[PDB]
Amino acid sequence: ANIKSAKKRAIQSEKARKHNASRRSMMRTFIKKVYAAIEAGDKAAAQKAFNEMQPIVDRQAAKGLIHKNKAARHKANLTAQINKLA
């Protein structure tokens, strides 16, 4: 980068990417746990994962990476899967 503003903004962006990658992967793993519990076929195990994945999928919505609509869609889909299970 030629301009100092761009030179610092590149470092700012790469640091933000490094910070947000871990946070995105964490919620990805937590949603993967809920999906694995759903495909397993256990209502209790599905809810035991959903009730703890919900705070981590709702706190980031008013924190950055994810959006309110995405969080609502994921929660609705997981709730529908839980309801239709068994």
Partner RNA sequence: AAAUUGAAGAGUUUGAUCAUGGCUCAGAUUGAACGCUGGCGGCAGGCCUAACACAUGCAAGUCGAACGGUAACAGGAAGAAGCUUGCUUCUUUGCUGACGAGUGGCGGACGGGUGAGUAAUGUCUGGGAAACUGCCUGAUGGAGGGGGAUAACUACUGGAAACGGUAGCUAAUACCGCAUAACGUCGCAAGACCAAAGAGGGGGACCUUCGGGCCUCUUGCCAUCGGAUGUGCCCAGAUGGGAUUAGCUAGUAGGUGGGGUAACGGCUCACCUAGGCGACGAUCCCUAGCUGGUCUGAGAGGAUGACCAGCCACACUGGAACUGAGACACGGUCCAGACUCCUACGGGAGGCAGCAGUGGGGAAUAUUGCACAAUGGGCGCAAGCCUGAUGCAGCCAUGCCGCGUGUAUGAAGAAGGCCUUCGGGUUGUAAAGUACUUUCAGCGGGGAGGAAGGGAGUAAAGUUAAUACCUUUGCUCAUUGACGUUACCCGCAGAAGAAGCACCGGCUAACUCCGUGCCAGCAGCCGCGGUAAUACGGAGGGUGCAAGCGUUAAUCGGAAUUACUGGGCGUAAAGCGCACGCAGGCGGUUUGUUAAGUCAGAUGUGAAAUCCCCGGGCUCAACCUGGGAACUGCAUCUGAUACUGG
Site residues (vs RNA, CB under 7 A): 1-17, 19-20, 23, 31, 51, 54-56, 58-59, 61-65, 67-77, 79-81
Nearer to RNA, 42 or 47 (CB): 47
Q: What angle do CA 77, 32, 83 make, to 5 degrees?
A: 35
- Scan for tokens 């910070």, then name that residue: 19
Q: What single DSSP character describes residue 61?
A: G
Nearer to RNA, 42 or 54 (CB): 54
Q: Minimal distance in Å, beta carbon 41 to RNA?
A: 15
